[PDB]
Amino acid sequence: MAALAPLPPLPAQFKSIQHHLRTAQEHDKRDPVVAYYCRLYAMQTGMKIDSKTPECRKFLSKLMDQLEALKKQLGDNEAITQEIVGCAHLENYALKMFLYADNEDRAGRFHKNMIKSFYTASLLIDVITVFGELTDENVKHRKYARWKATYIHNCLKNGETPQ
């Protein structure tokens, strides 16, 4: 039911965060909480790359409103009001994807989904780093996912069956 007005053309400047906002737009249909936090991360990295540019200004204004819209859309939400609750929710999401990938490995089958799953998990980790605090598992998971993601990708590229 919830929806946000269309966003202007995306310049190469925000290409690095394109994957972030892109996933957010997708989640908007799955979960608004994830999108809200996701958009927050994009904004931070956005302003850092380009504070306020007469051109990007349009993108920033729209993006900023998008987050504001979600806030009012829900209104009284623990995930929004309580950061701790939202933090635990995000962590759980990463765990679900993390296990899913491991489950596929045990099955003795590898697919492009595994790499995508690991990549998605890493993205969530960043969204969590925004809190300025990182857990031991969060940091370890990032490295583990980075290695597994690359290792699996490299193995396939070399035509070798992953371990």
Swiss-Prot record:
Annotated membrane topology: Peripheral membrane protein
UniProt-annotated stretches for the region Interaction with CHMP5: 2-75
Modified residues annotated as N-acetylalanine in this record: 2
Primary site of residence: cytoplasm
Region spans: Interaction with IST1: 2-163
Sequence similarity: Belongs to the VTA1 family.
Protein known as: Vacuolar protein sorting-associated protein VTA1 homolog
Record organism: Homo sapiens
Residue range from the parent sequence: 1 to 163 of 307
